[PDB]
Amino acid sequence: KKSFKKKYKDKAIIYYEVGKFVLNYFLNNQLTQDITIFGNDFLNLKTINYLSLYNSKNKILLQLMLIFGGKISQLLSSKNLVKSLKQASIGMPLGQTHLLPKALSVLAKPMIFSDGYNNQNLKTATTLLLSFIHKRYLYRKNLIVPKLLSFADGNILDEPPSPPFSSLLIPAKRFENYKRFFRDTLTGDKMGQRKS
């Protein structure tokens, strides 16, 4: 029992890093066609600013390849268990009882042990791409017009400042009843309650 579970876990863990380093080495020492070198894989904020503000699109695509090599390697090496789970026994996709057993194995996602992504990789990827879009105004320069300018959406129209500036206590007195209303009607006191 534990033997097979450990086999699956270990296979996934090993194939991850094997693919990660294989892609690192390839991109650094073989696309260039003196000394063999390796990367360090960490993207600072300084590095993200530099890459997104001064490099072209192909450079950013190379960085993303570096990020996703490990997951793709895990993908290329996993056994799809649907075949054996439906063979050794035989409205929902498991209700169809016909369709030659090969064309039946595509009605839903394959049963791969290691599914989903790691959250650090996703954070890095989306931050890099969001910087490229929002800070480097190419192909759309008119979207700078709504920059550091508010439009007063949800609030009281004219409100004076508060004690740190003005010794006036009416806005805070109303804010306290606002919070009472929130707790008693909308949210509750802990995540999961219908009300207070």
Binding site: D10, L23, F26, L64, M65, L76, L143, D153
Partner: protein, 89 residues
């Protein structure tokens, strides 16, 4: 304190401004898929190298997931091994 910037709820749901979220999202999704596809297309032609390097890495040693309770970079034996495997396969 209500919201006062209603702009459209006839074929979508929009509020004043936002113009800039469809462009952003389609760009992000397109670029991520292109990168993943290039990675897949490269690793798809080098499966033997993957099998070999994996065999070697297993027999060298690795930190089991449950033994470790409390690999960003490669050691030096593993670097010799990776360079050789790239030269052979």
């Amino acid at each position: 304190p209500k919201r006062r910037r209603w702009l459209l709820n006839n074929g979508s749901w929009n509020f004043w401004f936002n113009f800039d979220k469809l462009y952003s999202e389609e760009i992000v999704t397109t670029w991520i898929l292109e990168s993943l596809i290039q990675t897949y297309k490269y690793l798809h032609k080098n499966t033997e190298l993957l099998d070999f390097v994996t065999n070697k890495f297993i027999t060298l040693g690795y930190i089991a997931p449950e033994n470790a309770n409390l690999q960003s970079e490669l050691l030096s034996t593993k670097e010799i091994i990776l360079t050789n495997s790239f030269k052979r396969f």
